[PDB]
Amino acid sequence: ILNAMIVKI
Amino acid sequence: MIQRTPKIQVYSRHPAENGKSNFLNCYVSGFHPSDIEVDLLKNGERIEKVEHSDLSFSKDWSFYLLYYTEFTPTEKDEYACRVNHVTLSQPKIVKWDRDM
Amino acid sequence: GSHSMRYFFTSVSRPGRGEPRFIAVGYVDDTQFVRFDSDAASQRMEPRAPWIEQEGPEYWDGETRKVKAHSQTHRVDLGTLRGYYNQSEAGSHTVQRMYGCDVGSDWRFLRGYHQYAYDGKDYIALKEDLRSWTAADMAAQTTKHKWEAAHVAEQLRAYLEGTCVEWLRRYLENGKETLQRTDAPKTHMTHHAVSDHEATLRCWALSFYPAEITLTWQRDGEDQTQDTELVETRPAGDGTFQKWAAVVVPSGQEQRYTCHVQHEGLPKPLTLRWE
Ligand SMILES: [Mg+2]
Ligand SMILES: [Mg+2]
């Protein structure tokens, strides 16, 4: 499964 | 910015035998940026029923795609893959070399 | 043996043509199992291997929500990076991201990774200790400082050491017939005259899995690189891979050359000779 947190640059 | 020219391979899924159904593959790899046009040709004419893989990339970030179509080779039919990309001054046509 | 799960994300801006392209694909080893394509009809995470199709609707609903969240972050990132490099709105630019985990033969965590690229070159990567970041240039040092001040690596490390490994083990079990397999290469060699003085020997490896393979040529036992032509390992389209390597040799000296095949499906490496 994908990671649930994806923080922006 | 970096540009990388595609490497093009044209080949069958299984060893080819006239009259036996098979798949014709055009594998385009090592290219950048991702915009690319790939057609499979039968006697110079584009084949409509062609599938392709989902865009992915290698460890050096270069892209690869597989285009493929179901076909039955014959003695006389000639196949090719036509690729256009920003690194190509003109579209590149690579014939299926049946004798390698 | 050891195994990996990897997700690959590609984001491409389309100036004057609306929303950026976004494509995500997931792999276990060399086997793809999911995809999302912004330009496809479903707007859902979709299965691409039989063993994932059995996951239930909560799985597909949650992965669709998360891959959309990935898409939204990448859409903002394109604008941010255009600013960082003071680029015009007129050109198309590319963001790529890859993250995932490796496990050893005991299926315990081995290493995790998270790499990010802009326009085809490294931008920022998570270090192997999973605690801080490597910036590729001065613009990326801005992101390094921001992500280190905000402790971004901590949640990612928890994912890579935990969630990633646990779900990889689940996939390896559920897809064991496909994933816990090795197909040894089927090998042969062809011969073709080039002139009345030279011939091409071509060493072939077909129908193998996984993709990792080594084909090498030797003359009289000494490694041969003079004239060796190697093609990229390529997919057959049925879940296996193909590769060849060729040498141009003087007519009548064919018997001095050997092709050597190494693959994890082979108990012993193979040696082929034109004879
Ligand atoms: Mg690779
Ligand atoms: Mg902290």
Residue numbers in the entry:
A (entry chain C): 1 to 9
B (entry chain B): 1 to 100
C (entry chain A): 1 to 275
What does the paper say about this structure?
We developed a rapid procedure for accurately modeling large numbers of peptides bound to the common class I MHC protein HLA-A*0201 (HLA-A2), which was applied to a curated dataset incorporating thousands of immunogenic, non-immunogenic, and non-HLA-A2 binding peptides. Yet for a peptide bound to an MHC protein, the impact of features such as exposed hydrophobic surface and charges are determined by the peptide's conformation within the binding groove, as well as the size and position of the various amino acid side chains. As has been noted previously, nonameric peptides bound to class I MHC proteins adopt relatively conserved backbone conformations. Our hypothesis was predicated on the notion that immunogenicity is influenced by both peptide binding to the MHC protein as well as TCR binding to the peptide/MHC complex.
